[PDB]
Amino acid sequence: NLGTELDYDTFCFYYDWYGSEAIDGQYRHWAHAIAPDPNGGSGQNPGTIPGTQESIASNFYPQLGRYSSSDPNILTKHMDMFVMARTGVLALTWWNEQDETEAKRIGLILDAADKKKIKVCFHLEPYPSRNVQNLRENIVKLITRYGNHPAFYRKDGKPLFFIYDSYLIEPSEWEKLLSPGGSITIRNTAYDALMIGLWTSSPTVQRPFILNAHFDGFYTYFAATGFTYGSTPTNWVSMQKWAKENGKIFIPSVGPGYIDTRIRPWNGSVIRTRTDGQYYDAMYRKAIEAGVSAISITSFNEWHEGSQIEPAVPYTSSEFTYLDYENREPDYYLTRTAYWVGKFRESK
């Protein structure tokens, strides 16, 4: 009873797409295309970020440098950072890449997590031609391949998946997978799981979707307050009330800030400034105050979107002057997370 234990109802969104030239053949994701402006006309030549030491695809700079997500020693350090933050579940981005380098990374992550008693669940992304049939096939593959790993997450005996952009699939399709009567149901099978869909817009649209698709719960993802109805924290009390009334699990997503203008220069309206951690505090406070049973954190290391709690350091190159953690130390967002985990556990 030290107040330092991992919390297993706290989920931190984790990305394993970073590479080094040495380990992966390229500085993967540190190099990144610059997205054209959706409202910016037809002849755009936006360019790319080369992913050199001076110029990486983030408005911030990692304390660990241009790391490889395949590097066992980087993984060990990340797991130690999870321990520091008291975040007991790593929610791994999963893009269905069906290649051996990804299979290797997933094994390394599970192994490194287990050494620190961290758990892993999968964040199922909108991969090409994703539909309920191949989703089932991939759920089967993941549970079969990893269900016996000691680090594989379970809640009251069930695996848990977050489904990004779930709303892109019709409720009549979801019901085949998620209804107890569905033609390809996972309910009452070896592959049953808590399915947590992405709540985006207004209750008028989202309430029937969640009910008719038979999702077990919902999350909101976006670190930038106000980006969607779901990511507007003043809605969370109301959202929790509905969740409780309808037997659903609400897992609001909290983040320390947002900025993606290195890769999306036209997207400045979505910037949310960290102000020495006050933004993080405000958002985490709203989640706890809503009376939820679980909280998700956006993100551990989505460096592109500037939502990361992973330690960042001050850096000025000839190419760019990076943002940093201002008056706070590089590990401030890890220790502040630990602080909020404590408060969460206090009132659970």
Ligand X SMILES: OC[C@H]1NC[C@@H](O)[C@@H](O[C@H]2O[C@H](CO)[C@@H](O)[C@H](O)[C@H]2O)[C@@H]1O
Ligand Y SMILES: OC[C@H]1O[C@H](O[C@H]2[C@@H](O)[C@H](O)[C@@H](CO)O[C@@H]2O)[C@@H](O)[C@@H](O)[C@@H]1O
Q: Which residues bind ligand Y (CB under 6 A)?
A: 165, 200, 222, 228, 267, 270, 305
Answer for which of 209, 304, 312, 331 binds ligand X (CB under 6 A) is 304
| Of 34 and 270, CB closest to ligand Y | 270
Residue 23 binding target from ligand X, ligand Y, none, CB below 5 to 8 Å by type: none
Q: Which of residues 226-255 bind ligand X (CB under 6 A)?
A: none
Answer for which of 125, 173, 281, 289 binds ligand X (CB under 6 A) is 125
Long-range contacts of 22-27, Cβ-Cβ distance < 8 Å, separation of 24 or more: 22/68, 23/68, 23/70, 23/71, 24/68, 24/70, 24/101, 26/51, 27/51, 27/52, 27/56, 27/66
Structure tokens at 224: 């930038």
Residue 69 binding target from ligand Y, ligand X, none, CB below 5 to 8 Å by type: none
Residue 93 binding target from ligand X, ligand Y, none, CB below 5 to 8 Å by type: ligand X
| Of 159 and 257, CB closest to ligand Y | 257
Q: What does the alpha-carbon distance between residue 299 and residue 221 come to, in Å, rounded to a whole number?
A: 9
Name 168's Cβ contacts closer than 8 Å, sequence gap at least 6. 126, 130
Long-range contacts of 38-41, Cβ-Cβ distance < 8 Å, separation of 24 or more: 38/266, 39/266, 40/266
**DSSP code for 269:** G
Q: Is 173 in the site for ligand X (CB under 6 A)?
A: no
Q: Which of residues 81-100 bind ligand X (CB under 6 A)?
A: 93
| Of 152 and 236, CB closest to ligand Y | 236
Q: Which of residues 185-204 bind ligand X (CB under 6 A)?
A: none
Q: Which residues bind ligand X (CB under 6 A)?
A: 32, 93, 123, 125, 164, 302, 304-305
